[PDB]
């Protein structure tokens, strides 16, 4: 039914002409449109599947963006601006400023290669500033991932970089914004037991110990390592394998978190019940590595990045670095006068 109303040429709300699809999910899709009542300006419209789960998420997102766009009308803190919302043939549609590619599509279309370190630095700072602003307003985003970070403009120059032997796309401007506030939760709201997309899920979430702001910090840690590597660090759908991956990369989970989890399935007597010599086990041993072994250079800037990531990927949420502390980290010094 959604395909009936989201095609090129369609006009929504007697105003917005659909050009093309920007992205799709189980929530619905986002299409680029020409706004004929605003001079031809292109915008992005999110058309939400007509399903209670996703409908409530959209009403929720509207609430949250009205708050944030009011607090921060100039978008100093880099949340996407919502321009309008409306109903179209029973579907909630939310209009946003049009942005560039997500950091995920860019990596994908560039052959799954990493970003340059100086871009990672600017991007990381903006992500941390943005989400920290959410945290100031008693909000957790809960679904941070590279699909939900978008370049403001994804214009690029090309050069034959013979370090790979292939034409290369290089970002002109690495500014980003954060999108997708339909899972965002206030400190006082009910916290659902399963949040975040699998690969960016914090261990307190997987183990169902409760969560709040710190789980975003774990997500940002994952995002940063993917920017550095150009691939997903926890490419698994299974929770136990995910936990095994964490151990191979970050070492054993804290005894005290294991004792507390309602998810007894995953464990035996204080250790993860994981057979290293199994098929999946041997894959994890050879693929996954201790964090620091992923570094591509001993150069101090690389070390600095990896120190920050390590602190974002602290298992115990109570000990995990906060974004307020993260913004003062030495990795970011190169962005400041002195
Ligand atoms: N290019 C572009 N521009 C704005 C967007 C807003 C969005 C707002 N919420 C979710 C997804 C969204 C997108 N994929 C967007 N894509």
CATH-scheme architecture of the largest domain = Orthogonal Bundle
- And the CATH topology of the largest domain? Transferase(Phosphotransferase), domain 1
Question: Strand-and-helix sequence, N→C?
Answer: EEEEHEEHHEEEEEEHHHHEEHHH
What structural class do helix, strand and pairing data support?
alpha+beta
Strand content: 15-25%
- Count of DSSP strands: 14
CATH superfamily of the largest domain: Transferase(Phosphotransferase) domain 1
The CATH C-level name of the largest domain is Mainly Alpha
Head-to-tail CA distance between termini = 57 Å
* Strand line-up across the major sheet: 1-2-3-4-6-5
Silhouette: globular
Which molecules other than protein and nucleic acid are bound?
pyrido[3,4-g]quinazoline-2,10-diamine
The helix tally amounts to 10
Helix percentage range: 25-40%
Number of domains: 2
Radius of gyration, whole Å: 21 Å
What characterizes the major β-sheet? 6 strands, antiparallel
Binding site for ATP: 22-30, 46
Main location: nucleus
Domain Protein kinase: 16-332
GO molecular function: ATP binding; non-membrane spanning protein tyrosine kinase activity; protein serine kinase activity; protein serine/threonine kinase activity; protein serine/threonine/tyrosine kinase activity; protein tyrosine kinase activity
